[PDB]
Amino acid sequence: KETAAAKFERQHMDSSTSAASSSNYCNQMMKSRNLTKDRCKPVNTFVHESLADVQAVCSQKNVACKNGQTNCYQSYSTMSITDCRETGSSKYPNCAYKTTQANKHIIVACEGNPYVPVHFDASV
Ligand SMILES: [N]
Ligand SMILES: [N]
Ligand SMILES: [Pt+2]
Ligand SMILES: [Pt+2]
């Protein structure tokens, strides 16, 4: 039902603000985006840039993906991101996360027409 483009936006896009202020962002947004439903998703990044700016990475630096495919793209610019990483103590269904704000290049896998991000590969 959900398109891979729509899944990418649900898991990785939080355009709203350009920051992460609250130490509690990740506990709230991992819940909000259905990433704690059946299990605690251990690691997830949110991108705090406009959808147009993230969709434009698909015409920037072509690189290999971690899986060896060559439809990955590295943002020319650093972006506002939040890294959500499960704490050592976290136990479903009380999923717990540390929030880390950063500015880093993103690497996304692009596919389809329109040619848009379908996978978050890494930040660098
Ligand atoms: N959130
Ligand atoms: N931008
Ligand atoms: Pt949020
Ligand atoms: Pt822009």
Swiss-Prot record:
Keyword Ligase listed: no
Keyword Secreted among record annotations: yes
Reaction equation(s) it catalyzes: an [RNA] containing cytidine + H2O = an [RNA]-3'-cytidine-3'-phosphate + a 5'-hydroxy-ribonucleotide-3'-[RNA]; an [RNA] containing uridine + H2O = an [RNA]-3'-uridine-3'-phosphate + a 5'-hydroxy-ribonucleotide-3'-[RNA]
Binding positions for substrate per the UniProt entry: 7, 10, 41-45, 66, 85
Outcome of swapping residue 12 to A: Loss of activity
A biological process from GO: defense response to Gram-positive bacterium
Tissue-wise expression: Pancreas.
Effect of residue 119 to A: Loss of activity
GO MF entry, a single one: nucleic acid binding
Disulfide bonds: 26-84, 40-95, 58-110, 65-72
Residues at the active site: 12 (proton acceptor), 119 (proton donor)
Subcellular location(s) per record: Secreted
Keyword field: Disulfide bond, Endonuclease, Glycation, Glycoprotein, Hydrolase, Lyase, Nuclease, Secreted, Signal
GO cellular component, one term: extracellular region
EC number(s) per entry: 4.6.1.18
Residues carrying sugar: 1, 7, 34, 37, 41
Chief site of localization: secreted
Family: Belongs to the pancreatic ribonuclease family.
Quaternary structure note: Interacts with and forms tight 1:1 complexes with RNH1. Dimerization of two such complexes may occur. Interaction with RNH1 inhibits this protein. Monomer.
Function: Endonuclease that catalyzes the cleavage of RNA on the 3' side of pyrimidine nucleotides. Acts on single-stranded and double-stranded RNA.
UniProt name for this protein: Ribonuclease pancreatic
